[PDB]
From TrEMBL, chain A:
Binding positions (Zn(2+) 1): 62, 163, 193-194, 216
Pfam families, per database record: Peptidase_M42 (PF05343)
Residues binding Zn(2+) 2: 163, 194, 300
Cofactor(s) in the UniProt record: a divalent metal cation
Protein name, per record: 354aa long hypothetical operon protein Frv
NCBIfam families: lys_aminopep_Arch
A single MF term (Gene Ontology): metal ion binding
Similarity comment: Belongs to the peptidase M42 family.
Length: 332, 330, 328
């Protein structure tokens, strides 16, 4: 559990469709060191191949973050933005936003009068539209929650964009530590998941895997959750059960966990998605999919919080599944 | 001086707890040039700059609005209460700097996919554990610092009120030349909870002239043209009932003399400023208010213009030096 | 002393009318032990227990919340207005004790203060006036002292008579002390801490302690109340509270092994201590309270042990304090 590597994976620039701004390069480099080959497709997916014989498996964690984009700039240099993904305007009050302009990274704050959009005006220190632009701002400039990593103690930490950068980091770590494996493995850092799981769809079509595992984050029990949330922090990684989940693959997961003595949580999901596993399962002739998740609290806010112990068991389980996988009958 | 200014701003010290950090900063910074410095039973820092007449009191509160822990639940979450004008709205998905037994520790307010339901996560899984970490009923916290200089002039950061005026005042104090007036510079406490500190300090000082250096609203989005002051246009000084006319005309003169740009804003009512209790203190005092305009007051993103802070300091010392006995009787 | 206690609790005296009964009781009982006892122009009772230093003022308000008669209608019913924090909610189907020139007269509210009509058994305005009723006649919750058991009891006007009793009992049992003590029974607290303000100005103490009642955990409080009945006196922490004085209190309570609860009072308290702290040049203040349930109603209920432990701590604190720096 590398904290520095974890943090930079978490804070590397890369909103949906702009993953090339920083995160993609990190993923490629860290993967090229252990993979037999690493490519980047038309949409920006990073596909690392770890040669094996069978079965052919695809594991994916998205690299994109939710964020905002400048719709226009007014005469007084203020910015009017729109969301990129599931951005809660409630989480944009009295918050700092990291924008990526021509002249590099520039900050802006969303004030409050001493909620719906365009009631959301960003202040960037300008006095006119002309001045804002001269600062590098333009129609289409994108922004992200300002980074802020908070280590609360031994285990727990809070920060923007644990979704899905914490699962990305877990996948990458398991891949760096992968041992012997007869499965033909493809580790994918997908793009545009926050806006339609469009990255995993394109990559699963190119890869055409038999087995597919999406590593995403999931809700953890928290205040005012009214008891509807099953998973709990510190209780280990989570693996769904439901229509989107292949029983043979999921049953194999239990065993691996049992064998390596890794705590594993079960989470109801009577539908699919928003993981990449949704579009992976209906890819071409059909894929046996499963979901491996890290539970976090306060999803989609500047304070998503996780427990390093879960991250750890996710890395172990991910690795153990990959090495334990061999030819099987996935037909339900 | 961005270094010193940020220090004054982020120094600990919520209403009633100014001794956690801000109090010492202020004292030290002033012992350098002040003839005497002391602190009363409430924590007011009072610096004396001996002069003949008139006796003038200038104040800027050192207290920040913040929160306090009401209780810790079984799962280790904190339930807080507001100290000062804290809006539940500025507490969602935000970080809180708490001052526990074991030192400064952080917590975060959560959310889901009126204070009662403002629960703070500090990373504990039990009450015993939260306590183990140094959290006690009564523990206080403040917005987490995050100083952001937007450009050459503008910057945004929590607790611009009233630390920016406190800076400005301290700075003008350090740069004070010759003055005929007997000057008292006060770092007031508990101003956010009822101008309680200024009351006491002014009763002890008993000045003929008093000036409050606080922050005011600047034109910003959705203000509906109701706010007069504008960032970048200089320090502001009110006009109205609790603003002594003679004193205010004077400042108008000193301003134009030193050519400092000066904004004017109406205040038809005695304001939530220390100059409120200063004027009605003892037999009455000729009072005026000198403010730095800021946007988004009482939030983590209050923003100001350095050029305004600059002129406020210029005007501050100029007034303090040009001040000579005169009649303030309206 | 349940008898002295019930008597301090039931003694007449709403805000501004403390002279109707409680004042003289407070005066009489304090005169027996204090070195001097005086009544200022606003009605505050100020008892001095001469000492060296620091000079300390301790206050508990003698006033009660209540009602006043606005006018009498043709049919002899009274129309009242509240004196203090009285809510018509607590007036339905309740008996009210009025004070007329003819003496104590009772009235009942049957089954927004424009719907609160008091019936006194009169048939006409003239008969009501003949019974002793006038515009300005004041009234209180009828006394009704219920001992539930060995420790708990319920009664109107535990606020703030219970703390008044405690302070008085502590003063009567006071032993050797170095501080220059001033025990005050303040007036008009329920309408602006008016009494304590003037009293502190005169005394000009260096230290000040307010003894009031505070909320105790009770049904439907949804976990928002810290203090509980039976777990001892309570001492606030916050801006209105001087850290060093509070620290001192802690050590005293520990030294005597007196249970002491803590309560977060984030804002300037609604007690005499509020005005004591900003009095003249400033004062190191703190708050000592007895927790009670159902505040401001006819059934305010408390626990005897807490009352007792409050007297102990109050006594101990006064005998134990001495000159020390209170500068935060």
């Amino acid at each position: 559990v590398d904290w520095k590597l974890m943090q930079e994976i978490i804070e590397a620039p890369g909103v949906s469709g702009y993953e090339h701004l920083g995160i993609r390069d990190i993923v490629v480099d860290v993967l090229k060191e252990v993979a037999d080959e690493v490519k980047v497709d038309k949409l920006g997916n990073v596909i690392a191949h770890f040669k094996g014989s069978s079965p052919r498996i695809m594991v994916a964690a998205h690299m994109d973050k939710i964020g905002v984009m400048v719709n226009h700039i007014d005469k007084d240099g203020y910015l009017h933005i729109v969301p990129i993904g599931g951005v809660l305007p409630e989480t944009l009050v009295a918050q700092r936003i990291r924008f990526f302009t021509e002249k590099g990274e520039r900050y802006g704050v969303v004030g409050v009068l001493p909620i719906d959009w365009d009631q959301i005006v960003v202040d960037v220190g300008a006095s006119s539209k002309e001045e804002a632009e001269e600062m590098g701002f333009r129609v289409g400039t994108v922004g992200e929650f300002a980074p802020n990593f908070t280590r609360l103690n031994e285990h727990r930490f809070a920060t923007p964009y644990l979704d899905d950068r914490i699962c990305l980091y877990a996948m990458i770590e398991a891949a760096r530590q992968l041992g012997d494996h007869e499965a033909d493995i493809y580790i994918v850092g997908s793009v545009q998941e926050e806006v339609g799981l469009r990255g995993a769809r394109v990559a699963s079509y190119a890869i055409n895997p038999e087995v597919g595992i999406a590593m995403d984050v999931t809700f953890a029990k928290q205040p005012h959750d009214k008891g509807k949330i099953v998973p709990e922090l510190g209780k280990g990684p989570v693996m769904d059960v439901g229509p989107n989940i292949n029983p043979k693959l999921r049953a194999f997961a239990d065993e691996v966990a049992k064998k390596y003595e890794i705590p594993l949580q079960v989470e109801p999901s009577p539908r699919p998605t928003g993981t990449d596993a949704n579009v992976m399962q209906i890819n071409r002739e059909g894929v046996a999919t499963a979901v491996l998740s890290i539970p976090i609290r306060y999803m989609h806010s500047q304070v998503e919080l996780a427990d390093a112990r879960d991250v750890d068991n996710t890395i172990k389980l991910a690795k153990a599944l990959l090495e334990e996988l061999k030819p099987m009958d996935f037909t339900p």
